[PDB]
Structure formats: C-alpha cells, structure tokens
Write an enzyme that holds these catalytic residues in place. Structure first.
Site, PDB file in Angstrom:
ATOM      1  N   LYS A 180       0.793  -1.224   0.000  1.00  0.00           N
ATOM      2  CA  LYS A 180       0.000   0.000   0.000  1.00  0.00           C
ATOM      3  C   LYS A 180       0.836   1.290   0.000  1.00  0.00           C
ATOM      4  O   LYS A 180       1.672   1.499   0.871  1.00  0.00           O
ATOM      5  CB  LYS A 180      -0.933  -0.010   1.213  1.00  0.00           C
ATOM      6  CG  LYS A 180      -1.362   1.349   1.691  1.00  0.00           C
ATOM      7  CD  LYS A 180      -1.990   1.238   3.055  1.00  0.00           C
ATOM      8  CE  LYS A 180      -2.197   2.609   3.677  1.00  0.00           C
ATOM      9  NZ  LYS A 180      -2.649   2.528   5.107  1.00  0.00           N
ATOM     10  N   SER A 186      -3.774   2.453 -17.129  1.00  0.00           N
ATOM     11  CA  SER A 186      -4.326   2.407 -15.789  1.00  0.00           C
ATOM     12  C   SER A 186      -3.657   3.438 -14.906  1.00  0.00           C
ATOM     13  O   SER A 186      -3.906   4.630 -15.027  1.00  0.00           O
ATOM     14  CB  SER A 186      -4.102   1.018 -15.196  1.00  0.00           C
ATOM     15  OG  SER A 186      -2.722   0.713 -15.088  1.00  0.00           O
ATOM     16  N   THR A 235      -7.521  -1.776 -10.984  1.00  0.00           N
ATOM     17  CA  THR A 235      -6.807  -1.862 -12.243  1.00  0.00           C
ATOM     18  C   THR A 235      -5.367  -2.375 -12.087  1.00  0.00           C
ATOM     19  O   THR A 235      -4.935  -2.729 -10.988  1.00  0.00           O
ATOM     20  CB  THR A 235      -6.794  -0.472 -12.917  1.00  0.00           C
ATOM     21  OG1 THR A 235      -5.933  -0.499 -14.056  1.00  0.00           O
ATOM     22  CG2 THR A 235      -6.318   0.598 -11.949  1.00  0.00           C
ATOM     23  N   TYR A 236      -4.633  -2.438 -13.192  1.00  0.00           N
ATOM     24  CA  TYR A 236      -3.247  -2.880 -13.134  1.00  0.00           C
ATOM     25  C   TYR A 236      -2.345  -1.658 -12.895  1.00  0.00           C
ATOM     26  O   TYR A 236      -2.791  -0.526 -13.035  1.00  0.00           O
ATOM     27  CB  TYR A 236      -2.855  -3.602 -14.437  1.00  0.00           C
ATOM     28  CG  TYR A 236      -3.034  -2.808 -15.716  1.00  0.00           C
ATOM     29  CD1 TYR A 236      -4.294  -2.568 -16.233  1.00  0.00           C
ATOM     30  CD2 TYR A 236      -1.940  -2.306 -16.409  1.00  0.00           C
ATOM     31  CE1 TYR A 236      -4.465  -1.840 -17.410  1.00  0.00           C
ATOM     32  CE2 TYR A 236      -2.100  -1.579 -17.585  1.00  0.00           C
ATOM     33  CZ  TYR A 236      -3.364  -1.349 -18.081  1.00  0.00           C
ATOM     34  OH  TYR A 236      -3.537  -0.610 -19.231  1.00  0.00           O
ATOM     35  N   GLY A 290      -6.836   6.773 -18.883  1.00  0.00           N
ATOM     36  CA  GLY A 290      -8.112   6.340 -19.438  1.00  0.00           C
ATOM     37  C   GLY A 290      -9.187   5.743 -18.543  1.00  0.00           C
ATOM     38  O   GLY A 290      -8.905   4.877 -17.702  1.00  0.00           O
ATOM     39  N   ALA A 291     -10.429   6.190 -18.749  1.00  0.00           N
ATOM     40  CA  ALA A 291     -11.575   5.711 -17.976  1.00  0.00           C
ATOM     41  C   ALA A 291     -11.487   6.163 -16.515  1.00  0.00           C
ATOM     42  O   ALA A 291     -12.298   6.964 -16.035  1.00  0.00           O
ATOM     43  CB  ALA A 291     -11.663   4.177 -18.052  1.00  0.00           C
ATOM     44  N   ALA A 292     -10.499   5.635 -15.806  1.00  0.00           N
ATOM     45  CA  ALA A 292     -10.294   5.995 -14.412  1.00  0.00           C
ATOM     46  C   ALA A 292      -9.976   7.474 -14.368  1.00  0.00           C
ATOM     47  O   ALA A 292      -9.871   8.071 -13.300  1.00  0.00           O
ATOM     48  CB  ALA A 292      -9.129   5.185 -13.826  1.00  0.00           C
TER      49      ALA A 292
END
Lengths: 113, 113, 113, 113
Positions: free
Chosen positions: A9, A25, A57-58, A73-75
């Site tokens: 983390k 990602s 995601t990765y 992208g997207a995120a």
C-alpha cells in the site's frame, strides 16, 4: 485455506497527471513500485480521499523520482490530478503466510517519495 | 505467494453492438480472443473511455473478422455502442511467474483487428 | 497458472422477493443451486437486466420449486422484485481445467425452473 | 477446482467513527476480528444497510471492547457513522473444503459485542 490479504500500500500519494485517452491504468514512480513491491502489471486498487472514488486496475511502472502517479483512461473520470489517493494491492495466501506477514507499506512525500 | 496480474488486454476496441435483452456479457471477435488469449467464459473487465464505466463479466466468442464487440444485457447500460472501451483479464499466479511474464496485449484497428 | 472462470450461471431468473432487513444475500431455489451447482455460501454475482445493477455476495439455499430468488439486506437497494437478473459464479482453476470445462448454465422459466 | 466462499461475517455492526483523512480502511474491535477470524490486513467487504453502499478494502485491528468500527479515508464517503453495515470476508478454497465449512459468523450487540 486461502485468504486474500493486504500485501502492499502506497499511502497518501498525490495524483500527478491524468489522461482520458491512451491507456495505462495507473503509472507509478519506479521507486514506489519497488518500495511498495509492485510488479508492472498487477491488480491495484485506488481510493480517492478527496472524492471517495474506488477503482481496480493494473499498475504501470513510471520514471523514477518523477514522483509520477497517473491514471490513464476511464479511471481518468472518478479520480483526478491533485487528488490524494491510496493504492492498495492484496494477494491470496495460505492461511499460514496469512498469519505472519509484514505488508510493504509506503508513507509518501507531498512530492511522492 | 499468489499475486493477481494483468494476463491480457484488448486496447481501445470500439463497441460494435449492444443488447439489453438476452445475455452473453461481452461477445468478442474470435481472432481477438485468441490474439489476446481469452477463453470463452473468463472474467473480463471493461473500462469505457467515453464515459468511465467499469464492469466485470465473462467473455463470449463472437464471429471472426466481424470485429464484433458486443455488450449483452445489464452491462447494456453503462457501456454503449460507439464507445471506446478496454478489456482486461488478470490472473492470479505464483510470485515467480509474476516476475517474468509477457501480458498478451492487443492494440486494435478502428475496425477492431 | 490459475485463471478465474465462469463455473456456473442462472440465466434470466425473476426476483421473487426482497427484504432490506435481516440478511441472507441471495436465497436461491434449492433445485436451482443444485442445477447450477452452487453451495450454500459461495460468492455469487448478480446483474439486473432492468437496471444494470451489479453485486457480489454469497448464496443461500431457499425452498424447492418455490422458485425463490430473494435479495436480503443492502442489495435490497440496487436489485428489486420483478427484476430479471443474472447470477454468476466464477472459480479459479489450473490453466488445464480452464481449457476443457462445461459451465453449469441454467436457462430458466418465467416462474424459475 | 477453486471456488470463492464466505469465510467470515460480522452481522449488523454499527459504524462507530469515520475519518476522511489518514487511512486504515476499516478498523475493527480486536475481539471482533478474532471472533470473526480476520487478520489485520485482509480484504473485507462492507455493505451499508442504511444506504446500500458497497466497498472492498482491508481490515485494521482496533482496540478491544471499544466496539470500534471505523471507516478511514475515501470509504468515509459512501459509509457513515451510525450506519448499520455488514462486513464480509470470502476466501478461495478447494472444492472439497468448499462443501464442508462453518463460516465464522458473528451476530453483534447494539454496542458491538
């Protein structure tokens, strides 16, 4: 049995950049991925402290020291630049390893370090 | 230990069709499933570039060259035709395989190829 | 390696009841759990055709022939009675089993059978 | 094969505190983590009875008897204090273990006990 658990983390990193088009990602500063022990291409979770967003995601290895932390992208929606987020990477393990294990936790700098 | 990692990804495909009724999660062009190494029936993640949606479902083998990329039922909301999405398929692996592994990444044509 | 894959799926069942209080995730008609091979207590995914909701929860064995399909607590929001949903259960497997495998798919009656 | 299944669940706990800044996902009363058999650092799911929210995060060992149940950062949105939530932790298992298994279920006090 096999339990899934917090393996790593990156605590409180600030979102460097963000680009809706072209994907990758989350691209993380090389130093952070090694510090937090993450492999280019590994399911990572993201939690945005500023707006409670949550993605899975990765992770993509970014340049060192650049303190890069980009959402590709997207995120790109949900999570944004200037956003304090948290990265989390679990991992299924044998109930044994489960018990005794030191999760690679990385507190970070306002500049990500 | 067992980490979950990016096994395959169809980058930037355009959503061919979409039908709320009758289910089949995401039906992908046969060639793409082989190219990206995906088995009919396998957890696949979709991220919509146009509207940041995010789903997790199985994949269905569609006809070849048809450049098919359909979203059957439920996911018919969130993800739509004419949308540039990304398909992702992870895979838990031994920390060993984890290290050295070439994820089958498939860049694609505006016609899906 | 270990890939996660569609093991079972109850196709197009109609949501019998729904109760916000007292929990039991999704209680399924016994016949359905055996037909679709599901064990009381097993991660099940639900996708609501009428409103694209998506949940992940365990399954609970309900009475036979009653064509029961209830959503207990929390998921009581998102997914509702009279809703056509889909139940899905994956399962990680050795890349071997992965290849050759017949997923226990159950098409169902307007009365769930 | 490997199926994912309900290993543990803390039923109807009331959210003690909540803090957007500083992270620790969900911090649970020690007694509860042992009672429900959860290890500090383990994917836990939360479902909010009052508002149907749904999160996936790790668990943090809080003080005993304090009946603590805090949501630290990000999840601080979605889930709130005074909220009756449910904690769930699955676990992938061999189809054998899957069959015969007693999930550690913990019913709790309005004060969390």
């Amino acid at each position: 049995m096999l339990r899934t658990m917090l393996k790593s983390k990156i605590h409180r990193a600030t979102v460097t950049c963000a680009d809706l088009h072209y994907v990758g990602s989350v691209t993380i500063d090389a130093d952070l991925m090694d510090a937090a022990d993450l492999l280019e291409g590994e399911q990572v979770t993201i939690v945005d402290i500023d707006n409670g967003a949550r993605l899975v995601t990765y992770a993509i290895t970014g340049e060192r020291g650049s303190g890069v932390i980009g959402i590709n992208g997207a995120a790109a929606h949900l999570v944004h630049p200037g956003d304090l987020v948290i990265l989390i990477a679990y991992a299924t393990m044998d109930d044994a390893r489960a018990r005794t294990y030191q999760p690679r936790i990385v507190f970070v700098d306002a500049y990500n370090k």
